[PDB]
Amino acid sequence: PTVFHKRYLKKIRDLGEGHFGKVSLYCYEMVAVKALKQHRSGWKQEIDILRTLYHEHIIKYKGCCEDAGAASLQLVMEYVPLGSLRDYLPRHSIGLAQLLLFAQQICEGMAYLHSQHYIHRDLAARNVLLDNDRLVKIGDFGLAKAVPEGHEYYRDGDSPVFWYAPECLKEYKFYYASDVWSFGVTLYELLTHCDSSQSPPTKFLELIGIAQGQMTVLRLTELLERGERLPRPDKCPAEVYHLMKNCWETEASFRPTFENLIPILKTVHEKYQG
Ligand SMILES: Cn1cc(Nc2nccc(N3C[C@H]4CC[C@@H](C3)N4C(=O)[C@@H]3CC3(F)F)n2)cn1
């Protein structure tokens, strides 16, 4: 609800861009401001969403301002200092216990998101932000959607297909279980420390090849239904990988909820946290 006056706004630098908008670091206190580059109508929804989302593992809304240069509003948020895990992990040697802590927190955050009856549709390492080495936050909701009252699923080249479940690439339906498939891929990223050479796009394209023209997704869909999966990350515990494969069930109903995962991650964490 707070109003930011674009007059006390000093642009420090760019923090990122993707899908619809761009995010820049601003001085006012330091804030991260997101701006919109049909897309317009969703932007009104996204903002409202973030305004009504309050959780220790979801980026904090702080207000809006007059984006004079683009017929709408900008979305002011808190500045998460250490950036996303995709940015951070490649540069910092993090232990397994810590990574599992991040994982548990992502689930806590996702569990809360779903209980608000929202799907995310873009859960990846690039969208998880590091506040400090013991705190992580979901930092973007550009694709987030409200799940229709009387349905269990919600119905683009900018889609993160390498993070998506088969029912998304195939039936174009997005279930809460779909986000869980995404979490599994996000868990994989963490365990590989977001190394570029091991990324979902890179590894999935090694399997599919690049002489597939307009059929990248169709090939992707059918290798997933042959039961093929992302490899086990080196130094990834056996049971953890099993936890990954369980999130990657072809049958979405065989997938654990984020509810179910919190208890399990909590225990696997305490284990290796010793
Ligand atoms: C590089 N860096 C970033 C920080 N911290 C920080 N504090 C708040 C938001 C934020 N975001 C950037 C990224 C990650 C989530 C979303 C917001 N981002 C996007 O790129 C969205 C797609 C889009 F541009 F709209 N990043 C520090 N260094």
250 shares a domain with 162: yes
Q: Which two tokens stand for residue 219?
A: 């090939």
Please name the amino acid found at residue 4.
F
Place of tokens 């999966």: 229
Q: At what angle do helices 238-247 and 176-191 cross, to 10 degrees?
A: 150
Cα–Cα distance for residue pair 33/15, rounded to 1 Å? 9
The candidate with the shortest Cα–Cα distance to 180, out of 122, 124, 102, 257, is 257
CB 12 within 8 A of CB 32: no
Q: Which two tokens stand for residue 250?
A: 């072809």
Place of tokens 């932007």: 43
Ligand 1 binding pocket mutation candidate from 17, 23, 67 (most atoms within 8 A of CB): 23
Rg for the chain (alpha carbons), in Å?
A: 19
- Beta strand pairing status for 174-175 and 153-154? antiparallel
With helix as H, strand as E and coil as C, how does the chain read? Answer: CCEECCCCCEEEEEEEEECCEEEEEEECCEEEEEEECCHHHHHHHHHHHHHHCCCCCECCEEEEEEEHHHCEEEEEEECCCCCEHHHHCCCCCCCHHHHHHHHHHHHHHHHHHHHCCEECCCCCHHHEEEEECCEEEECCCCCCEECCCCCCEECCCCCCHHHCCHHHHHHCCEEHHHHHHHHHHHHHHHHCCCCHHHCHHHHHHHHHCCCCHHHHHHHHHHHHCCCCCCCCCCCCCHHHHHHHHHHCCCCHHHCCCHHHHHHHHHHHHHHHCC
Please name the amino acid found at residue 29.
E
CB 131 within 8 A of CB 60: no
Q: Which two tokens stand for residue 12?
A: 């420090």
Cα–Cα distance for residue pair 174/152, rounded to 1 Å? 8
Cα–Cα distance for residue pair 124/113, rounded to 1 Å? 15
13 shares a domain with 99: no
CA atoms within a 13 Å half-sphere pointing along the CA-CB vector of 63: 12
Ligand 1 nearest-atom number relative to CA 32:
8
Which residues, including other chains, have CB under 8 Å from residue 75's CB and lie 6 or more apart? 33, 34, 35, 46, 47, 50, 61, 64
237 shares a domain with 174: yes
Phi and psi (nearest 5°) for 81? -65, -35
Alpha carbon 33 to chain centroid distance? 18
Residue count (the chain): 274
The candidate with the shortest Cα–Cα distance to 64, out of 48, 79, 52, is 48
CB 251 within 8 A of CB 103: no
Place of tokens 């250490």: 82
CATH of the domain at 166: 1.10.510.10
CB 34 within 8 A of CB 75: yes
Q: Which of residues 64, 79, 94 is at a domain's end?
A: 79
Method: X-ray
Cα–Cα distance for residue pair 66/69, rounded to 1 Å? 9
108 shares a domain with 203: yes
Cα–Cα distance for residue pair 167/241, rounded to 1 Å? 22
63 shares a domain with 189: no
Candidate list 14, 48, 122, 140, residue with the active-site label:
122
131 shares a domain with 17: no
Q: Which of residues 26, 60, 79 is at a domain's end?
A: 79
Q: Which two tokens stand for residue 40?
A: 């317009």
Residues having CB closer than 6 A to ligand 1 are 15-18, 21-23, 32, 34, 77, 79-80, 83-84, 87, 127, 129, 139-140, 142
CB 163 within 8 A of CB 124: yes
Q: Which domain holds residue 96?
A: 80-274
Cα–Cα distance for residue pair 88/131, rounded to 1 Å? 11
Q: Which of residues 52, 79, 106 is at a domain's end?
A: 79
End-to-end CA separation in angstroms for the chain = 44
Q: Is 198 exposed, middle or buried (0-12, 13-18, 19+ CB in 10 A)?
A: middle
